[PDB]
Design a protein around this ligand. Structure first.
Ligand SMILES: CC#C[C@]1(O)CC[C@H]2[C@@H]3CCC4=CC(=O)CCC4=C3[C@@H](c3ccc(N(C)C)cc3)C[C@@]21C
Lengths: 267, 12
């Protein structure tokens, strides 16, 4: 049993690495100074629109407007990327591609943002967030100052990230934590729960052992970590409401078809 | 599976 949980950890870690090119270690280094373009306002945003060439697409929309919009729209590019990376990594969780396709869709639909905010925290410190695969650093204060409702679309994630990073998880820990989140059996509209819960039981055992080996003096880390899953749901449901108020009060800005699918009929 | 982009992502 012990050796198999270990092998399962090792495997997920391996796929976690292939699937997400920029890692916590990689990005923690950059942040501690262990040379990124800094975005602090509009001008330095555009001047950093050649940070990684540009967030293009950059279709022939988003190209455009005031700062909050330009940023809101660049956020969708990166988050389509992320959904693909995540989908990819899910396929690698043993047992997952064996599930009903409808169940597979549901798990990803409901778990994707929880994972996006989990992974984003690796990329943050109290003062700002990395972007463009660590080539840019966007300041927190800039992100708040965004006005209409776009302010505080990111402040809550910073607040969560700062607490989450205090747990000081590494990539090996995060690898299994993310697996566990995807294999959540309480997703609305699951067809049959039993096989998903069987897999999670397994990831949970593996996570528990990982925490004990890797963080031997961190008391009740396993518990503290599952408690973060509630923090995470709040951010997700807060985010969704923001989404709903944009799709009305703000002008008709376009949405990537992939995001529309995930967003429609979810809470 | 009226999440068709996603169904494809998962469908190899
Ligand atoms: C639409 C939308 C949205 C958001 O969920 C809200 C904050 C966005 C974040 C801000 C800060 C930010 C800045 C950019 O310049 C592009 C990307 C970006 C985001 C988006 C994002 C999505 C996924 C990741 N991962 C998986 C590391 C990183 C950044 C989208 C975020 C999270």
């Amino acid at each position: 049993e012990s050796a198999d949980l270990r092998a399962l950890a090792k495997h997920l870690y391996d796929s976690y690495i292939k699937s997400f090119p920029l890692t916590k270690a990689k990005a923690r280094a950059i942040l501690t100074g262990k040379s990124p373009f800094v975005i602090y306002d509009m001008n330095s945003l555009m001047m950093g629109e050649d940070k990684i060439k540009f967030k293009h697409i950059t279709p022939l929309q988003e190209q455009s407007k005031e700062v909050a919009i330009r940023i809101f729209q660049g956020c969708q590019f990166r988050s389509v990327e992320a959904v693909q990376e995540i989908t990819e990594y899910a396929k690698s969780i043993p047992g997952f591609v064996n599930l009903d396709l409808n169940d597979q869709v549901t798990l990803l639909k409901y778990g994707v943002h929880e994972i996006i905010y989990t992974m984003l925290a690796s990329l943050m410190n109290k003062d700002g967030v990395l972007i463009s695969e660590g080539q840019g650093f966007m300041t927190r204060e800039f992100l708040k100052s965004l006005r209409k409702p776009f302010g505080d679309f990111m402040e809550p994630k910073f607040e969560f990230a700062v607490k989450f990073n205090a747990l000081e998880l590494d990539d090996s820990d995060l690898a299994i934590f993310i697996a566990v989140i995807i294999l959540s059996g309480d997703r609305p509209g699951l067809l049959n729960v039993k096989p998903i819960e069987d897999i999670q039981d397994n990831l949970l055992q593996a996570l528990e052992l990982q925490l004990k080996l890797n963080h031997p003096e961190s008391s009740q880390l396993f518990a503290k970590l599952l408690q973060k899953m509630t923090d995470l749901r709040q951010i997700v449901t807060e985010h969704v409401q923001l989404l709903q108020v944009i799709k009305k009060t703000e002008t008709d800005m376009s949405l990537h078809p992939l995001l529309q699918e995930i967003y429609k009929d979810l809470y | 599976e009226r999440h068709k982009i996603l169904h494809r992502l998962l469908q190899e």
